[PDB]
Design a protein around this nucleic acid. Structure first.
Ligand code: AGS
Ligand code: AGS
Ligand code: ADP
Ligand code: MG
Ligand code: MG
Lengths: 396, 320, 340, 258, 127, 254
DNA sequence: GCAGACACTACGAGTACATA
DNA sequence: TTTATGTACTCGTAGTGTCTGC
C-alpha cells in the first residue's frame, strides 16, 4: 500500500550510492566493517593506515537528518550481517543492559540458520541508536557500553548527535571516530530533482540552495517541507521563497562557541542591528546556554578589537566597564545559587553577565573563541586545596 | 446549589476548520490536509489563546469523523507523561490494528508537549521513525524551543501568529450575532485593546462584562477589567519629568494594590521589550531595575525603593 | 620537629611575657573557672592567639591539654556527596575548624556541638579561623551555644572579626590581642638564636626581621629558619631579605601594572591571577597585598592613589559578596589600569 | 476510673475495621456515645465517605458516660493495632477531656500485657448526617465475588460502569488495552445461602465509578462475607459491610458523564 | 527444518529447572557438555565455578523421573543464563523436557503438551 | 586440609541468614575444636561472634588453623542453591585460595561441586573482654522479636529496664508511646516457652532501633534468646546452637 | 498445613532543570 | 573538581501480601 507513506521513507536510500553526501564517511564505515574478520583473527593488535584493525567498535555522530541510521543499516544489510538495533525506547540501565545484549555480544544469531552464499549471516551487528538519549550518567549504561566496547565479539555501532557532552567523555578514544558532515548542495540538488520528477511538483533549481541553508542541511525536514508546501501549492519560485524561509527556519540551539561568536559581533549592537536583532533576541541567545555563556563571554571579552567605542573612550576603558559588570553579575549569580535560590534573577544575570559586557567590546576579533579556561584552573585549584588540607592533617 | 451556564469559550468553540479565523495560509494548509488525508507530523506553536489546540481537534475530527473515539489518542500534562507510560501507551496505540479509510491515519495528539521530559521525547523519536505509515503525531506547545531537535527534524513545523484586531472583531461580532446582546463600538474597541490578540481573553472579558452589566460599553468594560499593568508601567518609564512618573506610580500602582515585586518584574519586561530608546540607555535602565529587584527580593519592599529606582532612571535619562 | 616555630612555644601563662596586661586579664579569667563566659579572641594574624588559648586552657583545666588526638569523623550531606573531616580532639576540650567545603559546614558544626554537649565540669570548644564561617552556620551556632552553657563553653578564635554576625559578637566576651612590637619580636628572636647555634654578630639583622615580618611572629620565625639554613647557621649583616614566592609574584604583577597599560598586559595579568588563585591564596589577602603594593610605588600621584584605594574598597566589598574570586580581581586591575 | 472503657473480644476485629478504611481515609474521628463508637470521615479528594458504627453487642463491656470525640491519624492507629496478636484482648481507655487513649493487650495464657498510647488530634470536622434513604437498585452479592470482579476489571481501565437491568447485573470496564463485560444473574444457592446473590430493581441504573476508589472499597471484603450495593441515580452508591453489631457503609460519588 | 542432532537429552523439567537455577546463581554462562554418556552441566564465573554431573537411568517406580540420552556425536555447546531461565519458565507444561544438542545448530528445548509442544530454539554462543 | 561435612546444609544456611546484615566481611579462623569468628560492623557499635563445635558436624578434620576471609553474598547464593536431604561438605586445600562446597545427595542423580575464592580481609582484633553482666533474662526468640519490632515501629530508641522481675521494654516516639511488661512466667508442659530472670542489680539501658532490628535475623538459630545486661558493658544477645552459640555485643547508647 | 512464587505498593538514591 | 534547595523522574531495591501445590 503506497501513496500513504511519508516522503522520507518511500524515497529512502536502498543501496549505498543513493546516500547523498558524506561519501567518505560511508566508504570508511564499509571498509571498517568489511575487514573486522581478519582484525579479529589478528587480536586487534595490527592495523592498517586507517587504523580499522585496532578499533573494535565504530561510533557515528553528526547533525540530524544526514543519514547516519540509513547508511549504518545499508552497510549492515549489504555485507550479510544480521542487524540488531537498540534504542532509548528500550530501557538500558545497568540491570536491563547486563541482562540485555550482554549475552548477545559473544553469542550468534538464530534467525541466520533458517535464512540460508552468506559467510556473515550467523553474526550480529549492534546498531545502538539514540545513545545520547541515555542521560543516566553514573550507573546509567555508559560505563556498561564502555565495557562492551572493551570486550565484544561482534561489531558494535553507536549513533549519537555530538560529542561535547561531559556524559560522552568515557568514549574519548576507545571507539572509532568516524564523523558525518552537512551534505553538499549538489547531491541534495540531484536528489530533489529526482523527487520533483517523481512527485510532479515544480522545483526551481535556484530556490533549493535557500531551502537547504534555511534547514541547515537536514534532508528529512527538507523533504517534509517540500511535501507540505506542494500539498496546496506545488510551484515555488522567487515570489514565495522568502515566506517559506521565514516560516520554516530551522532555529537550532547555538553551540557554546557560537553564542559567544554571535554576541561579540559589533553589527548586532548598531542602530540597524538593534532593530533586526532585538534585545530580547540577545536575552534568548544567553538563555540558549545560560550555564557556559557567562564564562565564555568573560574569557574573551578583551581579545576583541573594539568597534562600538564611544568618541573619546579608549579600548581599556571599555574593557574596565565590561569587567565592572562582570563583577556585578557575579554577585547576582551567587545570590541565585545560594540558600534562598532566587531563580527569578536569571534574566538579570543575562544582561549583567553577557549582554552589557559584550556591548562595550564588540567588533572583529584578534583570534578564535577561547574555551572557558576557568574550569581547568578551578580543577587545579581544587586539587591544590585538597593537597594543602591533606598536608595540614598530616603535619599536626 | 444553582446550575451554571456553559462559558462562551467552549459554548462557541469551533468545530470546522472554516470557523477558526487567523493565519489564512495556515488554515488553508490545514484544509488542504483535511481534503487530501495524508497528514504529516506537525508541531503547532504560538502564543497562548490564539487557537492552537482547537485547530488540531477540528482537524482530527474532520479526518476521523467515524473513528475519533478509537483512533485518536489525547495526552497532556494532566496525564502521566513519563518514559514508562509513554512507551507502553504510545507503543500499544501505534501497533493497534484499526482499519481506517485509505487516506486516514491514526493521530496521536500531545497537548502542551513543551513540559515533556527529554527521555520521553527520545523514545518518541524512535516511535515516530518506526510507526509512520499507520500513525502520525501532532504536538501543540506554546514554545517549540523545549522540543528536542530530532523531533522537529522528523516533523513539519507550523507556527501560529498573534491575531490582528480585525479577526478578533469579526469573531466578536459573530458571537454577538449568535447570542443577543447590546453593545457599543467603544466597548468592543476597549475589549479588543485589553485582549491584545488573545481571543480567549476577549471572550472572557465580553462574557464578564455582559454578566456584570448587560451592555458592552467602555465604562462597563473598564470597570470589569482594569488597564493592563505593562501599559501603565511603560507610561511610567517613558515619561520624563520625574515628579510625573512618581505620581503615576503612587496613583496607578501603589494605591491600586499592585505588589512591588510585580511592578519591578513588569518594569524589567517593559524595558527589555522597549524600542523607542537606544540600546545603551535600555542596558543601564535594566541594570538599575535589577539592582532594585535585588533589593526587593532581599526583603526591603517599600514605596521608597520604587521611587528611588524611578529617580535613578530619570537621572540616567537627563544624562546626569 | 625540625621547624623552630612550633617547638619554641610557651605552654603556660607564666611563660608568656609578651603582654603583661593581656596575661593579667587571662589570669583573672582563669582564677575562677566556675563562672567563665564564652570567649572570642580577635586581632591581627600570627600574634599567637592559639598560644594564649592553649595557655588559658592549661591554666583552667590543668595539664594534658596538649595531648591532642587526631580522631576522624564521617558526615552525611545532600545526595551522595560524602565529606570526611578529622576532629583534633583532646582531653578536657575539643578543637574544630571549617576545613570542610565552605557552603556546607552548618551540619558539621551542628552535630559536633550537639554530640559534645551531651557529654572542670564543662568541656571547652575551640573554633580556629572563625571568620570563615558562613553566616547561616553562625546563626545555627548562636542558639546552640546559648542553650547549653553548663556543659559546653566556646573559645572562638578569629582574625578580622567583621564577618562575624552581631548576635555572636553579643554573646561572646571579646578579647583583643595586639600584634607584637619590634622590641618583642627582637627579644623572642634573640632568645631563639641564643638557645640555638647561629653565628650572629649584629643585632641589626634581628630588627630587620622584625621590620620585614610586619608584626608576624610565625612569619618572622619562618624567615629566621629559612635564611639560617641558607646562610649555613651564620647570619650576615648584609643578608638579603627573603620573601615568599607569593609576595615576589605579587610585586612583579604590581611592577607590570605600573610600567605598562595594555590589553596584552591585562591578559598576562589574568594568567598570573589564575596561577595565584590556583596556588591557594585567599582572594581577600591577594587584593589587599596588591593594593598595598600599588600604593607604595612612588611614581603614582596622590589622586591615582585615592582612586586606587576607593576601587580597592569597592572590589573588596564585591569579593565579600562574590563566589568566583577572579572576576572581581580582574575588574579591579582593569579599573586600576584605566585610572593610571 | 477511666470514663471510656471499651473491651474487644477477638482483638483482630478492631484491626479488621481499621484496615477496612486505612488506605482510603487518612484522618477520622470517633464520636463515642452510649450507643456505640461511630465514625465518619471524608477523603482528601472529597469523593468517598466512610461511615461506621459499632454497637454495644460487639463489646464485652462498654461504658461511655459522656460523648467523646477522638480525632485520629489512621496510619499511626493501624500501626498500633498491628503491635499485637489476635489472641490478646484489646481495650480502649480514655479519661475526661482526652489527650490520648490507652490500648491494652492482655491475655491470661501468658502475662505479657502491653500498654500503648496514641496521641489524639483536633480534626474539627462537624460533617453532617446521611440524607439519602431512597435507592433504585438494592443488590447483595458475596464479598469475594465482588472483590474478584473489581480486581480483574480494574486492570483493563480506570472507569468501571455498573449497569442494572431486569435480573441482570453488568460490569463494563472498556479501556485502552481492550474491554470487559461481566454479566452475573441472580440465583439462590440453597446449599450455600451465603453465596447467593439477590437483586431488587426499581428504576434502571447506569453509573460509572473510579477504579482506585472501588479497589479501596473492596479492600474491606475481609471484614464481611457479603456486601450490599444500593445504587441510585443522583445518589452516591452505598456499599454496606455488615458487622456483628453495626456496619461499615461506604459512599462513593459516580463520575460525571458528558 | 528437521535435522539430526549430535545428542538428544530428555530429563524431567523440574530437575532441569532446579539444576539450571542452581548454576545461574554462579555465572551468566553455562557450558553444557555431553561426553562418555555423562551430562556435564558446568558453569564458571567471577565468584566461583560450579559443576553438576548426572547419570542417565530408568526409574521403574516412576518413569517420568528418569534420564534418557542417546549418543550419536559428542557436543561442545555454551549457553547464557537469562535465556535458559526464560526457557525453563515454561517448564510447568511438561513433566519432562526434550533437549537436542548439535555442534553447529541451535539447541531445541522441547516441552511435549497433550496435543502439541512448545519448542525453544536457543543459539549456542561462540566456541 | 579442611573437611567439614555437614549432615544438613540448612544449619549453615540459617547461620549465614542470621548474620547477612550485621556484617559483610568475615575472617573464618577455623580451628580443631570448631569454627569461631569475630566481626565488627561499619559503625563500630555492633559486634557479632559465632561458634560452632565439632559436635554439630557429622565429620570434621582441621589439622592446621587457617584464617579464611570470605564473602557472605556468595555464600548466600551458594547456600540458596542448597536444600534439604543434601549434605554440604566444606572442603579446603593446603593453601586454599579457592574454597569448595560439595553438595552430596542421598542418590547419585545429581551431585554438585562449587567454588569460591578467598579475599583479603585483615584479621579483626580478638577482644576477649568478658565483664560480668548485672541482670540475665532468657525469653523465647519469637516473643522478643515481636516486642522489638512493634516497639521499633513507634520510635527509634527502645529503652530496656529491669526491676522487680518485670522487664519493661519502653519506646517513646512521636505518634505515641509503647510499654510492654513481662512477668517471670514458668511453664511445665512446654518448658521451652518460659521467662526467667536473674536480677542481681537493676539496670536501665537504651539501644538504637536499627541494631535491635538487625540482631533479630538470627532468630532462626534458636527458639530461645538469652540476654544479659550490664550498666556499662555491652549487652549480650546469645543464640543457642546444637554445638556452640552465636552472640551479639551492642554497647548501650544513652 | 507450610514453603515457596508471584505481583504488588513502598522506600531509597541519583540525575536534571530552575523565565517565559 | 561549582554552584545548592526544592521538585520531578527514574530506577532498582526490599519487604509485603496473596495464590499453588507438595
Ligand atoms: N543522504 C541522504 N540523502 C537523501 N535522503 C536522506 C539522506 N540521509 C537521510 N535522508 C532521509 O532521512 C531519512 C532518515 O534519515 P536518518 O539517517 O534516519 O536520520 P538520522 O541521521 O538518524 O538523524 P536522527 O536519528 O533523527 S538524530 C531517510 O529515509 C531519507 O528520507
Ligand atoms: N481563530 C480562532 N477563531 C475562533 N475562535 C478562536 C480562534 N482562536 C481561538 N479561539 C477561541 O479561543 C478558545 C480556544 O483557545 P485554545 O485553542 O484552547 O487556546 P490555545 O491555542 O490552546 O493556547 P494555549 O497554549 O492552550 S493557552 C475558544 O473559545 C475559541 O473560540
Ligand atoms: N610569649 C611568647 N614568647 C615566645 N613566643 C611566643 C609567645 N607568644 C607567642 N609566641 C609565638 O607564636 C607562635 C604561635 O603563633 P600562633 O598561635 O600560630 O598565631 P595565630 O594564633 O595567630 O595563628 C609560636 O611559634 C610562638 O613561638
Ligand atoms: Mg538515527
Ligand atoms: Mg492548549
Amino acid at each position: 500500500r503506497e501513496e500513504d507513506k511519508l516522503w522520507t521513507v518511500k524515497y529512502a536510500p536502498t543501496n549505498l550510492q543513493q546516500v547523498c553526501g558524506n561519501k567518505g564517511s560511508v566508504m570508511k564505515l564499509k571498509n571498517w566493517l568489511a575487514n573486522w574478520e581478519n582484525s579479529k583473527k589478528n587480536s586487534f593488535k595490527h592495523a592498517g593506515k586507517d587504523g580499522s584493525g585496532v578499533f573494535r567498535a565504530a561510533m557515528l555522530y553528526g547533525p540530524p537528518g544526514i543519514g547516519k541510521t540509513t547508511a549504518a543499516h545499508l552497510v549492515a544489510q549489504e555485507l550479510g550481517y544480521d542487524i540488531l538495533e537498540q534504542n532509548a525506547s528500550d530501557v538500558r540501565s545497568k540491570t536491563l543492559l547486563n541482562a540485555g545484549v550482554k549475552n548477545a555480544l559473544d553469542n550468534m544469531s538464530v534467525v541466520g540458520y533458517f535464512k540460508h552464499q552468506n559467510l556473515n549471516g550467523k553474526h550480529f551487528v549492534i546498531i545502538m541508536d539514540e545513545v545520547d538519549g541515555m542521560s543516566g550518567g553514573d550507573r546509567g549504561g555508559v560505563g556498561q557500553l564502555a565495557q562492551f566496547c572493551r570486550k565484544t565479539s561482534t561489531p558494535l555501532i553507536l549513533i549519537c548527535n555530538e560529542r561535547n557532552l561531559p556524559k560522552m567523555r568515557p568514549f574519548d578514544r576507545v571507539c572509532l571516530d568516524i564523523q558525518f558532515r552537512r551534505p553538499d548542495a549538489n547531491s541534495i540538488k540531484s536528489r530533489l530533482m529526482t523527487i520533483a520528477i517523481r512527485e510532479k511538483f515544480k522545483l526551481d533549481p535556484n530556490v533549493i540552495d535557500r531551502l537547504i541553508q534555511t534547514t541547515r542541511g537536514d534532508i528529512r525536514q527538507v523533504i517534509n517541507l517540500l511535501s507540505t508546501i506542494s500539498t496546496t501549492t506545488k510551484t515555488i519560485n522567487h515570489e514565495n521563497i522568502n515566506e517559506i524561509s521565514k516560516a520554516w527556519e530551522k532555529n537550532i540551539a547555538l553551540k557554546p562557541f557560537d553564542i559567544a561568536h554571535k554576541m561579540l559581533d559589533g553589527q548586532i549592537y548598531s542602530d540597524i542591528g538593534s532593530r533586526n536583532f532585538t534585545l530580547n533576541d540577545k536575552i534568548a541567545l544567553y538563555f540558549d546556554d545560560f550555564d557556559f555563556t557567562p564564562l565564555m563571554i568573560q574569557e574573551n571579552y578583551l581579545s576583541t578589537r573594539p568597534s562600538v567605542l564611544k568618541p573619546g573612550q579608549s579600548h581599556l576603558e571599555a574593557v574596565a566597564e565590561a569587567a565592572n559588570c562582570i563583577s556585578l553579575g557575579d554577585i547576582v549569580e551567587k545570590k541565585i545559587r545560594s540558600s534562598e535560590q532566587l531563580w527569578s534573577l536569571l534574566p538579570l544575570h543575562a544582561v549583567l553577565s553577557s549582554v552589557y559586557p559584550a556591548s562595550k567590546v564588540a567588533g572583529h576579533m584578534a583570534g578564535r573563541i577561547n574555551f572557558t579556561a576557568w574550569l581547568g584552573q578551578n580543577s587545579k585549584s581544587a586539587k591544590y586545596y585538597r593537597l594543602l588540607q591533606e598536608i595540614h592533617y598530616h603535619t599536626r | 446549589t444553582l446550575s451554571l451556564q456553559l462559558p462562551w469559550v467552549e459554548k462557541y468553540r469551533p468545530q470546522v476548520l472554516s470557523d477558526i479565523v487567523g493565519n489564512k495560509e495556515t488554515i488553508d494548509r490545514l484544509q488542504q490536509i483535511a481534503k487530501d488525508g495524508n497528514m504529516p507530523h506537525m508541531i503547532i506553536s504560538g502564543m497562548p489563546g490564539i487557537g492552537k489546540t482547537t485547530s488540531v481537534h477540528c482537524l482530527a475530527h474532520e479526518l476521523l469523523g467515524r473513528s475519533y473515539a478509537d483512533g485518536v489518542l489525547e495526552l497532556n500534562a494532566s496525564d502521566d507523561r513519563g518514559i514508562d507510560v509513554v512507551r507502553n501507551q504510545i507503543k500499544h496505540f501505534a501497533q493497534k490494528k484499526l482499519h481506517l479509510p485509505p487516506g486516514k491515519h491514526k493521530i496521536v495528539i500531545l497537548d502542551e508537549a513543551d513540559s515533556m521530559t527529554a527521555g520521553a521525547q527520545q523514545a518518541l523519536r524512535r516511535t515516530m521513525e518506526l510507526y509512520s505509515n499507520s500513525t502520525r503525531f501532532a504536538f501543540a506547545c506554546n514554545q517549540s524551543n523545549k522540543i528536542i531537535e530530532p523531533l522537529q527534524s522528523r516533523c513539519a513545523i507550523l507556527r501560529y501568529s498573534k491575531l490582528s484586531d480585525e479577526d478578533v472583531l469579526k469573531r466578536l461580532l459573530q458571537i454577538i450575532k449568535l447570542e443577543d446582546v447590546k453593545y457599543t463600538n467603544d466597548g468592543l474597541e476597549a475589549i479588543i485593546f485589553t485582549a491584545e490578540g488573545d481571543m480567549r481573553q476577549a471572550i472572557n472579558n465580553l462574557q464578564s462584562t455582559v454578566a456584570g452589566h448587560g451592555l458592552v460599553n467602555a465604562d462597563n468594560v473598564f470597570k470589569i477589567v482594569d488597564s493592563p499593568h505593562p501599559l501603565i508601567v511603560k507610561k511610567m518609564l517613558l515619561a520624563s519629568n520625574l515628579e510625573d512618573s512618581i505620581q503615576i506610580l503612587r496613583t496607578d500602582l501603589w494605591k491600586k494594590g499592585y505588589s512591588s515585586i510585580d511592578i519591578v518584574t513588569t518594569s524589567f519586561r517593559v524595558t527589555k521589550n522597549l524600542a523607542q530608546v537606544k540600546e545603551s540607555v535600555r542596558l543601564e535602565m535594566i541594570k538599575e531595575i535589577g539592582l532594585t529587584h535585588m533589593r526587593i527580593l532581599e526583603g526591603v519592599g517599600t514605596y521608597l525603593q520604587l521611587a528611588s529606582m524611578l529617580a535613578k532612571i530619570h537621572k540616567l535619562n537627563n544624562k546626569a | 620537629m625540625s621547624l623552630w616555630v612550633d617547638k619554641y612555644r610557651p605552654k603556660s601563662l607564666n611563660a608568656l611575657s609578651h603582654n603583661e596586661e593581656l596575661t593579667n586579664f587571662l589570669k583573672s579569667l582563669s582564677d575562677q573557672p566556675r563562672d567563665l563566659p564564652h570567649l572570642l579572641l580577635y586581632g591581627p594574624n600570627g600574634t599567637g592567639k592559639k598560644t594564649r588559648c592553649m595557655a588559658l586552657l592549661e591554666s583552667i583545666f590543668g595539664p594534658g591539654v596538649y595531648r591532642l588526638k587526631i580522631d576522624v569523623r564521617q558526615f552525611v550531606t545532600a545526595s551522595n556527596r560524602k565529606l570526611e573531616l578529622n576532629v583534633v580532639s583532646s582531653p578536657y576540650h575539643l578543637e574544630i575548624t571549617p576545613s570542610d567545603m565552605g557552603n556546607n559546614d552548618r551540619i558539621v558544626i551542628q552535630e559536633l556541638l550537639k554530640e559534645v554537649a551531651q557529654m572542670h565540669r564543662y568541656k571547652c570548644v575551640i573554633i580556629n579561623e572563625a571568620n570563615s564561617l558562613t553566616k547561616d552556620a553562625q546563626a545555627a551556632l548562636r542558639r546552640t551555644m546559648e542553650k547549653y552553657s553548663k556543659n559546653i563553653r566556646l573559645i572562638m578564635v578569629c582574625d578580622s572579626m567583621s564577618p562575624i554576625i552581631a548576635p555572636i559578637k553579643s554573646r561572646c566576651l571579646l578579647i583583643r590581642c595586639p600584634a607584637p612590637s619590634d622590641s618583642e619580636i627582637s627579644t623572642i628572636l634573640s632568645d631563639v638564636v641564643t638557645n640555638e647555634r647561629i653565628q650572629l654578630e649584629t643585632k641589626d639583622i634581628l630588627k630587620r626581621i622584625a621590620q620585614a615580618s610586619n608584626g608576624n611572629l610565625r612569619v618572622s620565625l619562618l624567615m629566621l629558619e629559612s635564611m639560617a639554613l641558607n646562610n649555613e647557621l651564620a647570619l650576615k649583616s648584609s643578608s638579603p631579605i627573603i620573601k615568599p614566592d607569593w609576595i615576589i609574584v605579587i610585586h612583579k604583577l604590581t611592577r607590570k601594572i605600573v610600567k605598562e597599560r595594555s590589553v596584552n598586559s591585562l591578559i598576562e595579568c589574568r594568567a598570573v591571577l589564575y596561577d595565584l588563585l590556583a596556588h591557594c591564596i585567599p582572594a581577600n589577602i591577594i587584593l589587599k597585598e596588591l593594593t598595598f603594593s600599588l600604593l607604595d610605588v612612588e611614581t603614582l600621584n596622590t589622586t591615582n592613589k585615592s582612586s586606587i584605594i576607593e576601587y580597592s574598597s569597592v572590589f573588596d566589598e564585591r569579593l565579600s559578596l562574590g563566589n568566583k574570586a577572579i572576576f572581581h580581581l580582574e575588574g579591579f586591575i582593569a579599573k586600576v589600569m584605566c585610572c593610571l | 476510673a477511666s470514663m471510656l472503657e471499651a473491651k474487644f473480644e477477638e482483638a483482630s476485629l478492631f484491626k479488621r475495621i481499621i484496615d477496612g478504611f486505612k488506605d482510603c481515609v487518612q484522618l477520622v474521628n470517633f464520636q463515642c456515645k452510649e450507643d456505640g463508637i461511630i465514625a465518619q470521615a471524608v477523603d482528601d479528594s472529597r469523593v468517598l465517605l466512610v461511615s461506621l458504627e459499632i454497637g454495644v453487642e460487639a463489646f464485652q463491656e462498654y461504658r461511655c458516660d459522656h460523648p467523646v470525640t477522638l480525632g485520629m491519624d489512621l496510619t499511626s492507629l493501624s500501626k498500633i493495632l498491628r503491635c499485637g496478636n489476635n489472641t490478646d484482648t484489646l481495650t480502649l481507655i480514655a479519661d475526661n477531656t482526652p489527650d490520648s487513649i490507652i490500648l491494652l493487650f492482655e491475655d491470661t495464657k501468658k502475662d505479657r500485657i502491653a500498654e500503648y498510647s496514641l496521641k489524639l488530634m483536633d480534626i474539627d470536622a462537624d460533617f453532617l448526617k446521611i440524607e439519602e434513604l431512597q435507592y433504585d437498585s438494592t443488590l447483595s452479592l458475596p464479598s469475594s465475588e465482588f472483590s474478584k470482579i473489581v480486581r480483574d476489571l480494574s486492570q483493563l481501565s480506570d472507569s468501571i460502569n455498573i449497569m442494572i437491568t431486569k435480573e441482570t447485573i453488568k460490569f463494563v470496564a472498556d479501556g485502552d488495552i481492550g474491554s470487559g463485560s461481566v454479566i452475573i444473574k441472580p440465583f439462590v444457592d440453597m446449599e450455600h445461602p451465603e453465596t447467593s446473590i439477590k437483586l431488587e430493581m426499581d428504576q434502571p441504573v447506569d453509573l460509572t465509578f473510579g477504579a482506585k476508589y472501588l479497589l479501596d472499597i473492596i479492600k474491606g471484603s475481609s471484614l464481611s462475607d457479603r456486601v450490599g450495593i444500593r445504587l441510585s441515580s443522583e445518589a452516591p452508591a452505598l456499599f454496606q459491610f455488615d458487622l456483628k453489631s453495626g456496619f461499615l457503609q461506604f459512599f462513593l460519588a459516580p463520575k460525571f458523564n458528558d
